[PDB]
Design a protein around this motif. Structure first.
Motif, PDB file in Angstrom:
ATOM      1  N   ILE A 158       0.606  12.412   5.641  1.00 33.14           N
ATOM      2  CA  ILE A 158       1.988  12.918   5.596  1.00 33.14           C
ATOM      3  C   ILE A 158       2.055  14.436   5.586  1.00 33.14           C
ATOM      4  O   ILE A 158       3.023  15.041   6.033  1.00 33.14           O
ATOM      5  N   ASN A 218       9.835   3.742   1.739  1.00 34.16           N
ATOM      6  CA  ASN A 218       8.781   4.276   0.888  1.00 34.16           C
ATOM      7  C   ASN A 218       9.154   4.694  -0.538  1.00 34.16           C
ATOM      8  O   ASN A 218       8.273   4.920  -1.363  1.00 34.16           O
ATOM      9  N   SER A 266       0.447   3.479   3.677  1.00 36.58           N
ATOM     10  CA  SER A 266       1.419   3.355   4.768  1.00 36.58           C
ATOM     11  C   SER A 266       2.510   4.429   4.705  1.00 36.58           C
ATOM     12  O   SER A 266       3.003   4.779   3.624  1.00 36.58           O
ATOM     13  N   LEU A 267       2.883   4.939   5.876  1.00 37.59           N
ATOM     14  CA  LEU A 267       3.879   5.998   5.978  1.00 37.59           C
ATOM     15  C   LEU A 267       5.184   5.407   6.477  1.00 37.59           C
ATOM     16  O   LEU A 267       5.248   4.214   6.777  1.00 37.59           O
ATOM     17  N   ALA A 268       6.224   6.235   6.570  1.00 39.76           N
ATOM     18  CA  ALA A 268       7.518   5.764   7.056  1.00 39.76           C
ATOM     19  C   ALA A 268       7.410   5.284   8.505  1.00 39.76           C
ATOM     20  O   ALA A 268       6.699   5.883   9.316  1.00 39.76           O
ATOM     21  N   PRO A 269       8.108   4.189   8.834  1.00 44.94           N
ATOM     22  CA  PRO A 269       8.045   3.645  10.196  1.00 44.94           C
ATOM     23  C   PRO A 269       8.619   4.664  11.159  1.00 44.94           C
ATOM     24  O   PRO A 269       8.204   4.777  12.317  1.00 44.94           O
ATOM     25  N   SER A 270       9.587   5.412  10.647  1.00 47.07           N
ATOM     26  CA  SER A 270      10.222   6.490  11.379  1.00 47.07           C
ATOM     27  C   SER A 270       9.250   7.627  11.723  1.00 47.07           C
ATOM     28  O   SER A 270       8.954   7.877  12.902  1.00 47.07           O
ATOM     29  N   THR A 271       8.765   8.311  10.686  1.00 48.24           N
ATOM     30  CA  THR A 271       7.812   9.409  10.843  1.00 48.24           C
ATOM     31  C   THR A 271       6.556   8.945  11.583  1.00 48.24           C
ATOM     32  O   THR A 271       5.860   9.751  12.198  1.00 48.24           O
ATOM     33  N   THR A 285       0.805  -1.222   0.000  1.00 48.12           N
ATOM     34  CA  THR A 285       0.000   0.000   0.000  1.00 48.12           C
ATOM     35  C   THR A 285       0.843   1.278   0.000  1.00 48.12           C
ATOM     36  O   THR A 285       0.705   2.120   0.887  1.00 48.12           O
ATOM     37  N   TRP A 329      10.414  -0.622   4.865  1.00 47.16           N
ATOM     38  CA  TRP A 329      11.270  -0.693   6.050  1.00 47.16           C
ATOM     39  C   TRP A 329      12.734  -0.292   5.842  1.00 47.16           C
ATOM     40  O   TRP A 329      13.375   0.242   6.746  1.00 47.16           O
TER      41      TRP A 329
END
Lengths: 762, 94, 382
Positions: C225, A311, C159-164, A15, A307
Motif C-alpha cells: 500500500i 478494509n 489483501s488491499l482494496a479491490p479499487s486500489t 487477511t 468488498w
C-alpha cells in the motif's frame, strides 16, 4: 489471546492488515465473538424442557451486531459472555432454539451475537415452545377525539400520571416487547405484550405518556399490534432502492470449503463429530463431513469486509446469515454482493452464496456496513438562484413540510412569504398591519432592537424599522435587483433550501452518524440546525432574518444609496509566486494602522488563490494600489527579509502606503473601486461583514439567540467533536482549553466568567 | 461529565460562537484542512444551490494536497447537491 | 553467476526441461532433494504456509496435478524449488563435461548470486565429490526453504482494496506486492520521489531501495500500500507512450521510464524481515558453512569483498543477513575483475540475470553464456 486471534484468521481465510499487527490498526474478527462466547451460545441448548437429539442438530442462523459507537474487538480485551434463550419453537424441519448472546467489556455491552440451532425431527412438546420478539417500533397519530377516544377505550392502554398533555394533536410512539407461547404451530397458547408509549414534546423531550399491558391465551393473532398496524405506521425502517447496486459485479466472488474441517474445529471450539469424523456424521444421515456452518459464514463475511467496507472493519456494524446450504468439503462456493438499501447512514448489503455446480443457496443475509468518511458543508450567500429547491419542494413530502412550517411562520408574523420571494422574485414587496392578526405583526416590527453605543460609552437601543409605530398601516421592503438579493430575505431562503434538502437525505437514510459539518458565513447557521437540533426551524429563520437585518443596518449610506464601505477578493498568486498568505496580511495590517482607515482580511478561502478583504473604499483603493506596485515591481519578500531587516521593508512599506494613499484621497470622495491584478471587488456589498466593524451589534444579536435557542433542546453529543465553526477553525470541543482559544479570539464576558468558575463544572 | 453541566456549557459556547461570527474573519482554509487532513474524508459533500464550496475544495486539493493524496492513497470524491445529485442518493441504473 | 526471482513465474517449466532432457544426470538428486522438502513440509511451522503441499515428484509425473501459477511463485515454495533448478543446471554442466564438481569448480575465478543465488553460489563452491556435492545440495536447499518460509511468516500477504488493486493493474503496473521495479530512472531522481512519499508516511511503513541492478535500474520495498502511493506520484511525472517530444527542447521533456510490481512475495532487503532473521538462524545451526570451505571466491551481495576473508564463520548467518536485511548492490559485487566470460546458471531463459548484467558490461568485452537454455530470442548472449 494475541495468538488465538491469528490462529482463527489463518484458518477461516481472512487477511486484513487490521487482523495483523502492522498498519495503524490491530483488531480481532467479530467472528471471534462466536469463538469467545462459544460457551454461553451453546449451553442453553441442553436444559430438560428443550430436549432433543443433539447429534441431529444443525447450526441454523447466526447474526452479530455491534453496539453503536463501540470499537471492535482488540487483543488485550476481557470479555464477559452473557446469554439467554430468546425463543424455542418447533418448526416443521425440526425444533429450533434462539440464543441471544451479549459480549460485554469493561462493564459495557459491545456486541450481541444472536444464533439459531436446529434439533431436526418431529416435535410436539409445544408445552415448551415460546418466543420473545421485539415488536416493530410504530407511530400512531391521534388526530380526532374519535381516534384518542379509541386509543383510551382499549383495555391494554394504560395512561400515566405524568402530565395531562392533550394527546389530541400529537402522535405517539409504540415500542413494544412481547412473549408468545405456541400450542399448534398455527395457534398461540398464550401471548403477552408489554411496551412503552412515548411522546416527543415541541422541546424534543421524550416522555412515557403511558404503557402497554395485554395478555391472553389461545390467540390467533396479536390484537395490540394489529390495532397499531392500521391506525398507525412503522418507523425507523430500511430504505431500499428500485435499482440494487451490484458491488462485486458479474465477476463472481469464489470461495472453497477447505479439505479438513479440523483446522476450524481447533480454532473455534466446536469439535462436533459431525464435521470431522466419518462414522459420527454417518449416524445422523448427512451428506457427510459437512463443512462448518459458522466457517462458511466467517468466510463470505470477509468478502463483505474487504468488498463493501473496503478494509476498515469498523464500518461493518452488522452481519446476519441464514445458512441453508450444507456445504461439503472442497466445494466451490459463489458469492454475490449488492448494495440493496440504506439505514441510518449505513449501506445495507444483500449477501448471497451458492453451490457453484447446482446453484443451490448456501448463505443468504444482509450486512449493515458503514459508508466512507464524509463531510457536509453548507454554502453561504451569493449562490441564491430564483426558485431554488422548488423542484424538490414538489417531489418531496419532507422538504415540502419544512418550507411550509417556515412560510406559515413568516406570513403570520412578519406578513410575507419567503416561498413567494423565492419562486418569483419581487423587486418590491409590502406587508400590511390590518385587523386583529395584523396589529400583532407590526408589534414584531416594533419589537426589533438594534445596538450601537456612543463614543462616550452609552448603549443606544434603536428601532430597526424606524418608520413603524402604532399609527402605521404598512411597511415596504425594496431592492432594484430583486428581494431575493437583499439579505433579510436572501438568508432565510438559502437556509431553508438547505435544511429541506438535507432533511430529505436524512429521510432516505444517507446522513452519517459520525461525520463533520461546517458552514460558510450563513451556512454555519443552517449547518447547525441541519445535523444538530440547535433549534426548531421557525426559530432558525427568525434568527437568520434578524441577522440579515442587523447586518444591513450596521453601515451608513446617503440618499443616492452610496454606502461607506465595500468588499473585494484577492489572489496572491497573481502578484508573485513567492507572495505568502502572511505577505497579504502584512500589506493589509500595515495599510490599516498607517492610513488609519478600516481594512482586514475577512475571508480565508484557498491557501494561495482566494482571500477577501473588507473596509473603507480608500482602504481597498490603497491596498488595490500597493499590489499593482509589487506585482509590476516583480518583488520577492523572501529575498527582502534576508537582505533588509523587518524595519527596512516595514519602513519601505510605510512609503508606498502614504504614496498610494494620498492619490486615492484627492480622487473623488466615493471611490468606485476597480479591477486590479488580483484585486477584483465584489459587486453588491455595503457592509464590511466578518470584520471588527460589526463588533458593535454583537450585543443585541446574542440576547436574541438566547431567546431563540433553548438549553434543553441541545445535545452536547451532536456538536461535541463534529462541528467546525468560523471563528475556531478546529472541531468544536467543550474543554476548558477551548474557551481559552475562544476567549483569545473573541473576549466573551460569559466565557471569562465561565472560565473562572471552571472548577465548578467538574 | 455532568449532563446538566455539559449542556449549559456547549450552550453558551455555541451562543457565543454564533454571536461573534459577525466580527471574526471566516477561516475556511483551516476548516477545509480539518476535513481533508485531520479527518481524511473520502467524501466531501456540499449542500446548496451551486458548487461554490466544491470547486473551492477542489482547488485546495491542487495547491496543497497534490502530494499528500498521491502518497497516502487517499481517495477523494467531492459532491455538490445540484450537480452530483444521484451519487448522493445512491441511485444508479443496472 | 546465479539468478533469482526476476519476473520468473515459469521456473517450474525449467525443471521440466531438466527432468525431460537430462534424466540420467539429474533424476537421482531430483528424487532425493524432493523427499527432503516433503519432510520439511510436514514440520508443524511449515504446514500453514504449504497448504497445497510440496510434492515435486508428483507434479512432474502427473502435470495435471501441478499447483496454480500463484502457488509456485510464493516464497516458501519459490525459494527452495528454484535453487533445485540452479543445482541441476550446474550438475548437468559438470556431468555433460565428464568432470566432477570440484573440477569445473576449479576452472572459475569467482562466483556471486542475485539474492536467492548467493546461497547456491556459496554452497556450490564447497563441493568437489558428487558425494561432497549432494551434501551441500541438501544444505543449500534446506537453507532456502527456511529463509523463504520464515520471511513469509514475518511479513505475510495482506489483501488491499479491490479499487486500489484494479487501479494498479489498469495503469500499466501490476498486482501490488512489496517489491517495485523502476527502470530507466536515476538514483538521485528515484530517491527524491521515495523521499516525498516517505514524508507523509508513518515510519512503520516507509519505503526502501532494496536492490541496485545498474545505474538506471532499481527495486523498491516497503508495504504494498505504501509502494502504491509511490506509483501514483510517479505517473503524474512520467509521460504517456503516446506523447511525441521530437519537437520539444531536451531539458524540457518529460521522463521516459517504466515502473512495475514484481512477482516477489515478501519484503526482502528491508527492515521488514527483522523478526524473521532470528527464527531462520535457529533452524539451521545443525549445519555450518565456514569461510575456509570455499574453493572459489564468493563475493558478498552488499560489497564485492570475498567471503573467504572470514574467520571460518558460518556463511549461513551471513547468507541470511544479505538476503533478508541488506541492499543488493549488484553491479559492485559483479565487478569480476578482468573477465571474458560469465556463466548464468540462474533461473529463467533469456530472463536470467545474465542478460541484465550483460548490459551492465557490454562495453568492457565481457561475453555471457546462459547455461540453462540451448537457444533463445537474444543475440547478444551465447
Amino acid at each position: 489471546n494475541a495468538q488465538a486471534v491469528a490462529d482463527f484468521v489463518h484458518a477461516v481465510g481472512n487477511t486484513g492488515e487490521a487482523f495483523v499487527d502492522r498498519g495503524k490498526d490491530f483488531f480481532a474478527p467479530m467472528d471471534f465473538a462466536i469463538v469467545v462466547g462459544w460457551k454461553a451460545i451453546t449451553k442453553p441448548i441442553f436444559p430438560r424442557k428443550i430436549d432433543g437429539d443433539l447429534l441431529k442438530l444443525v447450526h441454523l442462523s447466526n447474526g452479530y451486531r455491534m453496539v453503536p459507537g463501540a470499537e471492535p474487538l482488540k487483543v488485550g480485551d476481557v470479555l464477559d459472555t452473557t446469554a439467554q434463550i430468546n425463543a424455542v419453537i418447533n418448526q416443521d424441519s425440526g425444533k429450533m432454539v434462539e440464543v441471544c448472546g451479549t459480549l460485554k467489556r469493561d462493564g459495557k455491552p459491545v456486541m450481541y451475537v444472536t444464533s439459531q440451532f436446529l434439533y431436526r425431527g418431529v416435535y410436539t412438546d409445544y408445552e415448551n415452545t415460546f418466543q420473545r420478539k421485539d415488536e416493530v417500533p410504530m407511530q400512531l397519530h391521534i388526530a380526532t377525539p374519535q381516534d384518542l377516544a379509541v386509543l383510551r377505550s382499549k383495555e391494554w392502554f394504560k395512561l400515566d400520571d405524568q402530565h395531562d398533555i392533550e394527546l389530541l394533536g400529537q402522535t405517539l410512539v409504540f415500542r413494544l416487547q412481547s412473549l408468545v407461547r405456541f400450542k399448534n404451530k398455527n395457534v398461540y397458547s398464550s401471548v403477552q405484550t408489554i411496551g412503552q408509549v412515548l411522546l416527543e414534546l415541541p422541546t424534543k423531550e421524550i416522555i412515557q405518556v403511558a404503557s402497554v399491558d395485554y395478555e391472553a391465551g389461545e390467540s390467533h393473532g396479536n390484537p395490540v399490534i394489529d390495532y397499531l398496524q392500521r391506525h398507525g405506521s412503522s418507523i425507523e425502517q430500511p430504505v431500499n432502492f428500485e435499482n440494487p447496486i451490484p458491488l462485486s459485479g458479474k465477476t463472481p466472488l469464489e470461495l472453497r470449503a477447505p479439505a479438513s474441517n479440523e483446522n476450524y474445529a481447533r480454532v473455534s471450539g466446536d469439535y462436533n463429530p459431525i464435521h470431522v469424523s466419518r462414522v459420527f456424521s454417518s449416524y445422523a444421515n448427512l451428506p457427510g463431513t459437512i463443512t462448518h456452518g459458522m466457517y462458511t459464514s466467517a468466510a463470505v463475511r470477509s468478502l463483505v469486509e474487504t468488498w463493501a467496507a473496503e478494509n476498515n472493519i469498523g464500518r461493518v456494524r452488522s452481519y446476519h446469515v441464514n445458512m441453508v446450504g450444507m456445504v461439503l468439503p472442497n466445494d466451490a462456493i459463489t458469492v454475490k454482493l449488492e448494495h440493496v438499501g440504506m439505514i441510518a447512514g449505513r449501506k445495507i448489503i444483500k449477501v448471497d452464496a451458492r453451490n457453484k455446480d447446482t446453484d443451490e443457496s448456501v448463505l443468504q443475509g444482509e450486512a449493515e456496513v458503514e459508508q466512507p468518511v464524509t463531510a457536509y458543508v453548507f454554502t453561504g450567500q451569493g449562490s441564491q438562484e430564483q426558485g431554488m429547491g422548488m423542484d424538490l419542494y414538489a417531489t418531496s413530502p419532507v422538504a415540502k413540510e419544512v418550507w411550509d412550517r417556515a412560510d406559515k411562520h413568516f406570513r403570520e408574523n412578519y406578513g410575507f412569504s419567503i416561498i413567494d420571494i423565492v419562486k418569483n422574485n419581487p423587486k418590491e414587496l409590502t406587508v400590511h398591519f390590518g385587523g386583529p392578526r395584523g396589529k400583532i405583526i407590526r408589534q414584531n416590527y416594533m419589537s426589533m432592537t438594534f445596538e450601537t453605543v456612543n463614543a462616550d460609552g452609552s448603549i443606544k437601543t434603536e428601532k430597526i424599522f424606524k418608520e413603524v409605530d402604532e399609527n402605521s398601516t404598512s411597511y415596504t421592503y425594496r431592492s432594484p435587483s430583486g428581494l431575493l438579493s437583499a439579505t433579510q430575505f436572501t438568508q432565510p431562503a438559502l437556509t431553508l433550501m438547505e435544511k429541506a434538502s438535507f432533511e430529505d437525505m436524512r429521510s432516505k437514510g444517507l446522513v452519517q452518524r459520525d461525520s463533520t459539518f461546517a458552514g460558510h458565513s450563513l451556512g454555519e447557521y443552517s449547518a447547525l440546525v441541519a445535523l444538530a437540533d440547535v433549534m426548531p426551524i421557525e426559530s432558525l429563520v427568525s434568527v437568520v432574518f434578524y441577522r440579515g437585518l442587523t447586518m444591513q443596518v450596521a453601515v451608513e449610506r446617503d440618499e443616492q444609496g452610496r454606502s461607506n464601505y465595500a468588499m473585494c477578493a484577492v489572489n496572491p498568486s497573481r502578484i508573485s509566486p513567492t507572495f505568502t498568505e502572511q505577505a497579504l496580511q502584512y500589506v493589509v495590517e500595515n495599510i490599516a494602522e498607517v492610513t488609519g482607515w478600516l481594512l482586514e482580511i475577512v475571508n480565508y478561502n484557498v491557501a494561495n488563490m482566494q482571500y477577501v478583504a473588507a473596509g473603507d473604499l480608500r482602504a481597498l483603493d490603497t491596498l488595490a494600489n500597493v499590489l499593482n506596485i509589487l506585482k509590476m515591481q516583480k518583488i520577492d519578500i523572501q529575498a527582502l527579509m534576508q537582505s533588509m531587516s523587518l524595519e527596512d521593508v516595514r519602513a519601505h512599506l510605510v512609503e508606498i502606503i502614504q504614496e498610494c494613499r494620498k492619490q486615492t484621497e484627492a480622487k473623488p470622495q466615493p471611490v468606485q473601486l476597480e479591477r486590479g491584478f488580483a484585486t477584483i471587488p465584489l459587486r453588491g456589498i455595503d457592509v464590511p461583514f466578518h470584520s471588527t466593524f460589526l463588533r458593535s451589534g454583537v450585543k443585541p444579536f446574542r440576547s436574541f439567540l438566547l431567546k431563540k435557542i433553548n438549553k434543553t433542546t441541545i445535545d452536547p453529543s451532536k456538536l461535541i467533536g463534529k462541528y467546525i465553526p468560523n471563528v475556531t477553525a478546529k472541531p468544536f470541543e467543550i474543554s476548558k482549553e477551548y474557551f481559552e482559544e475562544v476567549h483569545r479570539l473573541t473576549g466573551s464576558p460569559k466565557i471569562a466568567n465561565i472560565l473562572a468558575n471552571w472548577d465548578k463544572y467538574e | 461529565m455532568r449532563p446538566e453541566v455539559e449542556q449549559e456549557l456547549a450552550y453558551t459556547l455555541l451562543v457565543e460562537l454564533l454571536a461573534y461570527q459577525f466580527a471574526m474573519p471566516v477561516r475556511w482554509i483551516e476548516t477545509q484542512d480539518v476535513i481533508l487532513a485531520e479527518k481524511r474524508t473520502e467524501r466531501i459533500v456540499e449542500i446548496g444551490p451551486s458548487d461554490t464550496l466544491g470547486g473551492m475544495a477542489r482547488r485546495t486539493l491542487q495547491s496543497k494536497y497534490e502530494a499528500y493524496d498521491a502518497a497516502t492513497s487517499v481517495q477523494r470524491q467531492i459532491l455538490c447537491y445540484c450537480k452530483d445529485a444521484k451519487e448522493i442518493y445512491y441511485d444508479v441504473e443496472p | 553467476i546465479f539468478g533469482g526471482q526476476g519476473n520468473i513465474e515459469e521456473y517450474f517449466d525449467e525443471l521440466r526441461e531438466i527432468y525431460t532432457t537430462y534424466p540420467s544426470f539429474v533424476e537421482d538428486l531430483i528424487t532425493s532433494i524432493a523427499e527432503l522438502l516433503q519432510s520439511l513440509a510436514r514440520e508443524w511451522d511449515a504446514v500453514k504456509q504449504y497448504p497445497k503441499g510440496l510434492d515435486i515428484l508428483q507434479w512432474l509425473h502427473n502435470p495435471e496435478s501441478q499447483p496454480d501459477t500463484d502457488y509456485l511463485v510464493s516464497a516458501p515454495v519459490s525459494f527452495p524449488l528454484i535453487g533445485l533448478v540452479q543445482l541441476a543446471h550446474y550438475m548437468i554442466t559438470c556431468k555433460t563435461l565428464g568432470r566432477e564438481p570440484g573440477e569445473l569448480l576449479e576452472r572459475f575465478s569467482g562466483t556471486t548470486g542475485h539474492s536467492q543465488g548467493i546461497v547456491v553460489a556459496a554452497a556450490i563452491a564447497t563441493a568437489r565429490t558428487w558425494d561432497e556435492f549432494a551434501t551441500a545440495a541438501k544444505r543449500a536447499v534446506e537453507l532456502l526453504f527456511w529463509i523463504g518460509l520464515r520471511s513469509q511468516q514475518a511479513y505475510p500477504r495482506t489483501s488491499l482494496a479491490p479499487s486500489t488493486l484494479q487501479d494498479s493493474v489498469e495503469n500499466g503496473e501490476g498486482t501490488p506486492t512489496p517489491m517495485l521495479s523502476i527502470r530507466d530512472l536515476t538514483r538521485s531522481a528515484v530517491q527524491e520521489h521515495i523521499d516525498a512519499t516517505n514524508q507523509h508516511l508513518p515510519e512503520d511503513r516507509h519505503i526502501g531501495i532494496s536492490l541496485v541492478n545498474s545505474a538506471r535500474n532499481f527495486v523498491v520495498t516497503g508495504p504494498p500500500i505504501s509502494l502504491y502511493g509511490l506509483n501514483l506520484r510517479l505517473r503524474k511525472v512520467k509521460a504517456p507512450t503516446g506523447l511525441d517530444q521530437n519537437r520539444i527542447p531536451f531539458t524540457q521533456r518529460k521522463a521516459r521510464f517504466v515502473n512495475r510490481f514484481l512477482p516477489i512475495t515478501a519484503p526482502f532487503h528491508s527492515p521488514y524481515l527483522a523478526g524473521a532473521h532470528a527464527h531462520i538462524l535457529g533452524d539451521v545451526d545443525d549445519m555450518k558453512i565456514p569461510a575456509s570451505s570455499l574453493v572459489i571466491p564468493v563475493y558478498d551481495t552488499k560489497t564485492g569483498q570475498d567471503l573467504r576473508e572470514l574467520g571460518d564463520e558460518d556463511i549461513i548467518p551471513e547468507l541470511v543477513r544479505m538476503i533478508t536485511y541488506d541492499p543488493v548492490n549488484w553491479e559492485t559485487a559483479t565487478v569480476f575483475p578482468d573477465a571474458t566470460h560469465i556463466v548464468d546458471f540462474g533461473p529463467g531463459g533469456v530472463s536470467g540475470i545474465g542478460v541484465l548484467t550483460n548490459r551492465n558490461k557490454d562495453g568492457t568485452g565481457v561475453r555471457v553464456i546462459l547455461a540453462g537454455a540451448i537457444d533463445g530470442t537474444n543475440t547478444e548472449v551465447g
